[PDB]
Amino acid sequence: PVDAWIREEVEIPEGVEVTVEGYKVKVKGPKGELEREFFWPGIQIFTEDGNVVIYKDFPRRKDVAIARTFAAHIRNMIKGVTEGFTYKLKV
């Protein structure tokens, strides 16, 4: 194990409410609702105060990578639900 435990936090802005049931996380905001199932053996996701916490005991390199990508995905959900995304293409 690279460390005793790993704990990644994702802050929740005022306009967004985040809920977790089992291994599936819901993010609701003024623009819509988003879902996703984040599963990895040993990683547990819960909401504490105003943050979403991805936590694991005695993680390894791959576990750390998985936790970081999960945090990035949750941040992407919050970003999309609170302003959304726009792509530009040139013909």
Add this chain to the structure above:
RNA sequence: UUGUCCUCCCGGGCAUCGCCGGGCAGCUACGCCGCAGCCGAUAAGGCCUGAAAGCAUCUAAGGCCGAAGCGGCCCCCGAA
């Protein structure tokens, strides 16, 4: 229609069916009719999201397309 025999005529036997021309039915080909391009998942490859590795990155987790190849539609045998 040739040779021969039944005496001759008609009518017949044999000579590869005696030989030659034609020939329906049947069988045949050299004849004629019939043989779908659509769904599903993939290989190489082309991409999205994304960290390990505050950036980057098609890959580590996750997702989308993608072969005369693979599975189904189709045909034949099939209640030991």
